[PDB]
Amino acid sequence: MNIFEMLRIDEGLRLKIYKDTEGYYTIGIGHLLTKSPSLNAAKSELDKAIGRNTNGVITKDEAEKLFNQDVDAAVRGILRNAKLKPVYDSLDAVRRAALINMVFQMGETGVAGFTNSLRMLQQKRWDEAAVNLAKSRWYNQTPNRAKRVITTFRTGTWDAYK
Ligand SMILES: [Cl-]
Ligand SMILES: [Cl-]
């Protein structure tokens, strides 16, 4: 298990434009295209992202290319953020993947707002952090996925993804 296999489980793989759990146009392995309700706007974002005039359909290789870029972008966002970087640096590689997962789903600014959970993670108060993380819109709207990520923070193992 690693961050790519983890997010592939959590996000799935779809080669045609679909709506994510929030209703937003998405493709591939959780590649958000736009929050606009216009399918045409989403297709324009897709064509720009891929470099060709699709029409809402991509290949598996193309989906994996976006995925690699999106995982990169999550890590780079963590490292450039003054709240997220110290927490990330303080973690083991398994829990680092859990934080990347959160940033992939919600964005750098969103995760950086979890001030109290971030402090508990920095303090390595794993059970307390897990309780605090679940007190969130995140957990309520995607509870099975959040439970997997929270278990990863709590245990530092991949048990929730086996
Ligand atoms: Cl993008
Ligand atoms: Cl879920």
User: What CA–CA distances, in Å, run from 159 to 1, 42, 88, 150, 152?
Assistant: 10, 36, 21, 11, 7
User: Which numbered ligand comes closest to the C-alpha of 26?
Assistant: 1
Ligand 1 center from residue 49 Cα (angstroms): 6
Contact by Cβ (8 Å): 93, 100: no
- Apex CA 105: angle with CA 150 and CA 141, to 5°? 65
Domain total in the chain: 1
Catalytic positions, written as ranges: 11, 20
Contact by Cβ (8 Å): 5, 158: no
- Distance, in Å, from the CA atom of 85 to the CA atom of 139, rounded to the nearest integer, reads 23
Structure tokens, 42: 């989403």
- Asked if residue 68 is part of any domain, the answer here is yes
Structure tokens, 156: 């530092």
Q: How many CA atoms lie within 13 A of 155 on its CB side?
A: 11
The identity of residue 44, as a single letter, is S
Dihedral angle sign, alpha carbons of residues 88, 92, 76, 72: negative
Residue 60, SS3? helix
User: What CA–CA distances, in Å, run from 129 to 56, 117, 153?
Assistant: 40, 5, 8
- Distance, in Å, from the CA atom of 43 to the CA atom of 50, rounded to the nearest integer, reads 10
Contact by Cβ (8 Å): 7, 23: no
Query: Pairing mode, if any, of strands 31-32 and 25-28?
Result: antiparallel
Domain with 83, as residue range(s), is 3-155
Ligand 2 center from residue 93 Cα (angstroms): 23
CATH number for position 57:
1.10.530.40
Phi, psi of 35 (to 5 degrees): -95, 0
